[PDB]
């Protein structure tokens, strides 16, 4: 209870758990740290560890909302990056098999903010909220477990809207055909280097990348033992 920050620098952020009849003051504990990275999409972000089950951005909207009201700080979290509770998106099978249409830890995610003023506001608010559990455990915020996203996952057996599916297949097929068309023209367009080297492209080749991949993936028989004067002399040597 007295623990507010971990020595490695991860601040403990307890949450009050909901009340359920089957399960008659228990808490869940988060571990957070400021994130630094030159990458723009990863800039202005906050490490979060030990996320609750099915924690979306709409969840983060609520938690920051209570902190903003309680500590009168202006903080907006734009999106929650790298939120993979179940690891479905660990690998991108689309990107790996080809480049067209896809040019590209665990139990953690990156919480990006709208601006630096928002994240540093939240970090200061988070530090105070960490101190609360030691003094006043009652006023710890309450995590829901219920969202419009949550119920959709709950209803596993839902037939897909056929109208929605048809449109999705239509647009995806349309986009793929354009990219496939552009790639095939590029390879069979008489590519010439600046120093006048013309690339050799076989018929039916569709994408220049595959030529690169094909490259990456990939005298003794004509020699006579008895033809020269020295060869026959060598044979004469081994004969005796």
């Amino acid at each position: 209870e007295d623990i507010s920050a971990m020595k490695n620098g991860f601040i403990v952020v307890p949450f009050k758990l909901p009340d359920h009849k089957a399960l008659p003051a228990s808490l869940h504990f988060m571990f957070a740290k400021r994130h630094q990275s030159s990458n723009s999409n990863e800039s202005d972000c906050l490490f979060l560890v030990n996320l609750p089950l099915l924690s979306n951005i709409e969840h983060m909207k609520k938690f920051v909302g209570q902190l903003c009201g309680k500590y009168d700080t202006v903080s907006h979290v734009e999106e929650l990056l790298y939120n993979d509770e179940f690891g479905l998106h660990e690998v991108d099978l689309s990107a790996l098999t080809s480049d067209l249409m896809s040019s590209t830890p665990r139990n953690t995610a990156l919480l990006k903010f709208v601006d630096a003023a928002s994240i540093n506001n939240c970090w200061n608010a988070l530090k105070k909220y960490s101190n609360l559990h030691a003094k006043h455990p009652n006023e710890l915020f309450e995590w829901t477990y219920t969202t419009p996203s949550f119920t959709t996952f709950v209803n596993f057996y839902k037939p897909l809207d056929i109208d929605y599916l048809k449109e999705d297949i239509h647009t995806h097929m349309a986009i793929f055909e354009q990219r496939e068309a552009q790639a095939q023209e590029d390879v069979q367009s008489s590519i010439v280097d600046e120093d006048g080297f013309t690339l050799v492209v076989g018929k039916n080749t569709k994408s220049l990348n595959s030529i690169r991949k094909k490259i990456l993936n990939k005298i003794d028989k004509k020699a006579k033992k008895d033809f020269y004067r020295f060869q026959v002399r060598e044979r004469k040597k081994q004969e005796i």
Binding site: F10, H28, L100, P105, L165, M173
Partner: protein, 1077 residues
């Protein structure tokens, strides 16, 4: 052959008796012979005098029934010094070490002057022998007291080879001359001199008990008793000639013991009659001929393996009971005669003794089958069969060795009912000396005739039969018997015939103007149950019709009626063990479900007919690509679905049977994976809309599939047939396979194994699945009982919460092992027999070191050859080389379809794999301690549920048992297909998601089928978890923990069990009710 030869040597030395004990026993009975010589003689005595002589003595004469009465016993009795000798295996020095203990057979020859030429009539010789055994026992006793040896010797009477007519004295040692460590017991056999009685008078056809009917049993006992040293001398010669006689003999002895064969009589009921002596004599007979042309079948230069093979082959092929018999001369080349005596016969012209008189017809048929079965294993070259032939005991359990067992409790059991004792009469007494022999035949004949062709082999066993009695008593005492019948109850054991065990009508002789003898016996045998019926072909025959039931087989009804009508109207026949297993199969909610037999697959066929209607519709529609083929791969298409299909029963997990739809090869398929899947989905859209327009009576909808990891674009079309069946369609494209192989190649080296796992699941669903369903469907027809047992086996796994991690196809491959490879047992022919064999295999399966490889073929091509067979084991050694402990992979199941051997057995956590073996060991151990009964079966199918760390109870809002199609109900599909989920059970999906979230810390389990194992309403299911040992204790905080933990120190955290319960609670919503930690 060299491997076999070396393996034989290891067995002989292992069972070789320790020579020190030979000296220890030889030290004793050498002196015992001196004690016998001290025994003095008698004068002539009548029964009155000897009766007074033994009136006060502790010893009592073991007179054989019928005991001599003063009127017919006027012949006197006398004793004289015997000619002591040693016979049996010990004389030939061919014995082996037996933990239970062996016996030394010492023969005492009654001097010839004690007998008259007609002493073989009316038990006259037998009663003289019995008293001769008395003063031996009496005055042996006091000399043992004189020599102080009585402290550690226990003396008791016993029957030689369970022969009621040949009582003998047994000397045993309890805890210098103390030989208890030798585990030996000296048996004193009082034999007659050679050729006292004209052997021609003692032939099986002749009679020797006056009352005429023949007396084969009585004639054998006296004649064999007078021929002991002769056979020893005969066997001694052969041992000298051929060097491998003893090695062959010990192999035969070891083979016989594993099959539960002994030299004891079989007329009493116990399986036996063929022992080491009979095997040895047969080998000697074959060494001097044996063929129809009197040519030698065995040569003296043969090795142990060759001598054993010839004897086994001789029994397997040549018939010695019905058509043909073998004659040899102990004192002359052995020749096979074509004529048969209708009983097992190995005649000896020199001695006029039939060595197989103790061998019953019913037992002989089983012996021939076992010899034939081994001759196949012996000829096998692909697989080593040494362990199965010699190092596996099949006689431990009757249930495993026999398909069905019925115990018949006879009435008035301190003597049998007057009606029953009356049936014995004098006529059967002379034929059959004891009532037990008579009753054993009576049960066998009626049971054999009543069941007829429905069974292959029948055994009648008298449970609780004793063969040794105290010296103070004359005859063995049974607690139920009261000296009247030495058995508690009779048990009928059968080997059913699956093809025709469940025939509804028992055919009989055809009708004629004059009733034939066969027609007469058929009508008399069945009485009112008989009838004359006509069939569609127009034939008129006598047949009796029975009724099928889902709880018991037809054979139960037949034996119950057949025995009661003929044996006793008061008999109680009860086989409840089979009944419990039958009830454990879910009962489908179809018309006349209760009356349907468990071998009926009509429910599956009706599903297939609905598929064919949809099959025609799909082919005839016009699509951009022609439909190459539609392949059904669902569970119901191979007769393995746990609950039989039921129309409109969509709460069943297996309701939607998967189907593989393949189009003609094209070059227009997308080269990118997600485009390929969306291109596949585009084809399903046309199949949906064209089906919707042309055939409005069919309903359809789309659902997403995520079984293949990282391929999130799979969309499957579900078709709701009007008949009330569901089918799930998925498109297979030739480009799809190579796109995955492209994936493994292009992926980074550390990631390469993970993609291989994705490919492994893909081939399990799309490629290997078609091969699996094809072969299993074809094979299952030959193995009728495979479908019920695999369904019951899957039911057993679900109760213990194992199906969640064991893929259904792995369970089938384990469940088929007793069928394709029944050795050393027979193919299962009963639901009880099949299921227990599966458990027996799992209990003794050392999956760490032994691979499981199966030849999915019909009973004796596609059989695994030596090259393929060697290839697969090489794979196992390579895998175990990298995974010696088996943490990554536990079960190695391979076959022609799966040469890799890891396709169906990957991803199972180690605790689950050990739990599956742990439960199997417990299940077999429970059966050994407590015999198969109602309580034991319930304990098998009840889950302990206490080992798991925390247990969560769930209740569905509505009971799904009715909607699952299980008879303790919907009749049409809902108007809005969204209503389907309202009557579904998601907990299986719930556990799957939670496993993947808490993969590093928890192993959650649940019951896949709630309608079968969810109580009466089928609404209760339980989620059981297991915390790994690592995260159970406290750990230092690291970003790589990947676990939900709570701090205790600045750098110390512990698993937050309570918080996890919340996530399970909200993730279950209303369904969760209770927690138990």
């Amino acid at each position: 052959s060299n491997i076999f030869k070396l393996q034989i040597d290891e067995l002989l030395e292992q069972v070789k008796l320790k020579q020190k004990h030979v000296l220890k026993v030889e030290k004793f009975l050498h002196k015992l012979y001196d004690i016998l010589q001290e025994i003095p003689d008698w004068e002539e005595k009548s029964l009155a005098e000897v009766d007074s002589f033994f009136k006060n003595k502790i010893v009592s004469v073991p007179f054989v029934d019928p005991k001599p009465i003063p009127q017919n016993t006027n012949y006197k009795f006398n004793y004289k010094k015997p000619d002591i000798s040693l016979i049996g295996s010990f004389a030939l020095k061919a014995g082996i070490y037996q933990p239970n203990g062996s016996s030394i057979d010492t023969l005492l020859t009654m001097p010839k002057e004690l007998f008259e030429k007609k002493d073989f009539l009316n038990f006259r010789c037998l009663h003289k022998r019995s008293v001769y055994l008395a003063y031996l026992t009496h005055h042996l006793l006091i000399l043992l007291k004189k020599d102080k040896l009585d402290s550690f010797l226990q003396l008791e009477y016993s029957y030689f080879d369970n022969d009621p007519l040949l009582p003998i004295l047994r000397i045993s040692c309890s805890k210098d001359y103390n030989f208890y460590k030798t585990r030996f017991s000296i048996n004193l056999l009082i034999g007659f001199p050679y050729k006292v009685f004209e052997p021609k008078k003692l032939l099986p056809n002749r009679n020797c008990i006056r009352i005429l009917p023949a007396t084969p049993l009585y004639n054998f006992s006296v004649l064999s008793s007078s021929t002991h040293e002769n056979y020893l001398k005969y066997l001694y010669k052969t041992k000298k000639q051929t060097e491998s006689f003893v090695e062959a003999t010990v192999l035969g002895r070891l083979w016989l013991q594993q099959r539960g064969f002994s030299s004891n009589m079989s007329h009493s009921g116990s399986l036996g009659g063929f022992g080491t002596f009979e095997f040895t004599i047969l080998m000697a007979a074959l060494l001097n001929g044996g063929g129809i042309n009197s040519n030698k079948i065995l040569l003296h230069g043969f090795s142990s393996y060759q001598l054993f093979k010839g004897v086994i082959k001789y029994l397997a092929t040549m018939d010695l009971c019905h058509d043909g018999h073998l004659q040899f001369h102990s004192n002359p080349a052995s020749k096979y005669i074509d004529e048969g005596f209708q009983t097992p016969t190995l005649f000896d012209k020199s001695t006029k003794v039939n060595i197989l008189t103790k061998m019953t017809v019913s037992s002989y048929q089983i012996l021939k089958e076992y010899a034939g079965e081994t001759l196949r294993m012996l000829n096998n070259v692909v697989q080593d069969q040494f362990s199965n032939i010699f190092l596996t005991n099949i006689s431990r359990f009757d249930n495993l060795k026999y398909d069905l067992c019925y115990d018949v409790q006879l009435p008035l059991g301190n003597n049998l009912e007057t009606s029953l004792a009356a049936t014995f009469g004098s006529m059967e007494r002379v034929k059959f000396i004891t009532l037990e022999n008579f009753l054993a035949h009576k049960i066998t004949n009626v049971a054999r005739y009543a069941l007829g062709d429905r069974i292959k082999y029948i055994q009648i066993e008298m449970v609780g039969q004793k063969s040794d009695f105290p010296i103070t008593k004359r005859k063995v005492y049974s607690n139920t018997g009261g000296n009247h019948f030495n058995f508690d109850f009779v048990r009928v054991k059968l080997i059913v015939n699956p093809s025709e065990c469940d025939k509804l009508v028992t055919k009989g002789p055809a009708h004629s103007e004059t009733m034939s003898t066969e027609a007469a016996v058929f009508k008399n045998f069945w009485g009112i149950k008989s009838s004359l019926r006509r069939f569609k072909d127009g034939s008129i025959t006598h047949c009796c019709v029975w009724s099928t039931s889902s709880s018991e087989p037809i054979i139960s009804s037949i034996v119950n009626f057949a025995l009661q009508k003929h044996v006793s109207k008061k008999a109680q026949i009860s086989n409840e063990t089979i009944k419990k297993f039958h009830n454990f199969l879910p009962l489908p909610n179809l018309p006349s479900s209760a009356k349907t037999s468990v071998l009926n697959l009509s429910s599956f066929f009706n599903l297939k007919k609905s598929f064919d209607d949809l099959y025609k519709i799909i082919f005839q529609m016009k699509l951009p690509l022609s439909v190459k083929s539609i392949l059904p791969v669902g569970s119901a298409f191979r007769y393995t679905s746990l609950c039989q299909p039921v129309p409109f029963a969509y709460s069943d997990p297996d309701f939607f049977q998967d189907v593989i739809l393949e189009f003609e090869t094209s070059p227009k398929w997308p080269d990118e994976i997600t485009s390929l899947e969306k291109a596949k989905t585009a084809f399903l859209l046309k199949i949906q809309e064209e089906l919707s327009a042309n055939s409005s009576t069919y309903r359809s909808f789309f659902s997403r599939d995520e079984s293949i990891p990282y391929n999130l674009e799979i969309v499957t079309l579900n078709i709701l047939t009007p008949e009330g069946y569901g089918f799930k369609f998925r498109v297979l494209t030739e480009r799809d396979e190579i796109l995955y192989l492209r994936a493994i190649a292009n992926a980074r080296n550390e990631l390469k194994p993970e993609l291989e796992a994705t490919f492994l699941k893909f081939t399990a669903k799309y490629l290997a699945s078609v091969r699996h369903t094809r072969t299993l469907e074809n094979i299952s027809h030959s193995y009728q009982f495979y479908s019920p047992v695999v369904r019951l086996f899957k039911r057993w796994l679900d109760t213990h919460l194992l199906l969640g991690h064991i893929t259904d196809e792995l369970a089938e491959l384990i469940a088929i092992k007793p069928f394709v490879d029944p050795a050393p047992y027979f193919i299962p022919g009963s639901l009880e027999n099949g299921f227990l064999k599966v458990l027996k295999f799992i209990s003794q399966w050392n999956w760490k070191d032994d691979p499981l490889i199966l030849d999915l073929v019909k009973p004796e091509s596609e059989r695994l050859t030596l090259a393929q067979y060697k290839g697969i084991q090489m794979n196992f050694t390579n895998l175990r080389n990298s995974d010696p402990n088996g943490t990554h992979l536990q079960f190695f199941v391979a076959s022609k379809n799966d040469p890799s051997g890891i396709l169906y057995s990957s991803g199972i956590p180690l605790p689950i794999a050990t739990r599956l073996t742990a439960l199997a060991k417990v299940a077999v151990n429970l059966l050994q301690t407590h015999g198969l009964n109602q309580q034991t079966i319930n304990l098998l199918f009840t889950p302990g549920l206490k080992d798991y760390d925390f247990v969560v109870d769930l209740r569905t809002p509505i009971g799904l048992k009715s909607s699952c199609g299980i008879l303790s109900a919907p009749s049409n599909f809902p108007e809005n297909l969204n209503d389907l989920s309202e009557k579904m059970d998601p907990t299986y999906q719930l556990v799957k998601y939670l496993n993947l979230k808490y993969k590093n810390s928890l192993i959650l389990s649940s019951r896949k089928y709630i309608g079968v194992n969810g109580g009466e309403k089928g609404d209760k299911n339980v989620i059981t978890g297991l915390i790994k040992p690592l995260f159970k204790g406290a750990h230092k905080f690291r970003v790589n923990l990947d676990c939900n933990v709570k701090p205790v120190d600045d750098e110390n955290v512990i698993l937050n069990k309570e918080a996890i319960f919340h996530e399970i609670a909200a993730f279950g919503n209303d369904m969760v009710i209770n927690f138990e930690t």
